[PDB]
Curated annotation (Swiss-Prot):
Protein name as annotated: Myosin-binding protein C, slow-type
Domain Ig-like C2-type span(s) in chain numbering: 8-94
Family to which the UniProt record says this protein belongs: Belongs to the immunoglobulin superfamily. MyBP family.
Disease: Arthrogryposis, distal, 1B: A form of distal arthrogryposis, a disease characterized by congenital joint contractures that mainly involve two or more distal parts of the limbs, in the absence of a primary neurological or muscle disease. Distal arthrogryposis type 1 is characterized largely by camptodactyly and clubfoot. Hypoplasia and/or absence of some interphalangeal creases is common. The shoulders and hips are less frequently affected. Lethal congenital contracture syndrome 4: A form of lethal congenital contracture syndrome, an autosomal recessive disorder characterized by degeneration of anterior horn neurons, extreme skeletal muscle atrophy and congenital non-progressive joint contractures. The contractures can involve the upper or lower limbs and/or the vertebral column, leading to various degrees of flexion or extension limitations evident at birth.
Function as written in the Swiss-Prot or TrEMBL entry: Thick filament-associated protein located in the crossbridge region of vertebrate striated muscle a bands. Slow skeletal protein that binds to both myosin and actin. In vitro, binds to native thin filaments and modifies the activity of actin-activated myosin ATPase. May modulate muscle contraction or may play a more structural role.
Provenance organism: Homo sapiens (Human)
């Protein structure tokens, strides 16, 4: 999908993930290249923290959350720090006893 002087082939793109409130979020994606990338939610630079840890394995980016918070519900998007490619993703969180 050459668009702008790029040539990255998405081997294993992100897959829609749906879990209940609290569950441990997970998002793994592979690419035909070995380069670092960043994640973005609802069009914003996701924040990192003890709970939020972005693990990377060679040509694969993994992302899991300690507790699936309501905020999670939205649209996740990842992109390499070398190319201008973007991998869209959908997620949903089920309500629970923890509300109000």
């Amino acid at each position: 999908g050459s668009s702008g002087s790029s040539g990255l082939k998405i081997l294993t793109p992100l897959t829609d993930q749906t879990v209940n409130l609290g569950k441990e979020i997970c998002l793994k994606c592979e690419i035909s290249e070995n380069i670092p990338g960043k994640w973005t939610k609802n069009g914003l630079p996701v924040q990192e923290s003890d709970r939020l840890k972005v693990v990377q394995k060679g040509r694969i980016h993994k992302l899991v959350i300690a507790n699936a918070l309501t905020e999670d519900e939205g649209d996740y998007v990842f992109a390499p720090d070398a190319y201008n490619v973007t991998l869209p993703a959908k997620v949903h969180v089920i309500s629970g006893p923890s509300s109000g």
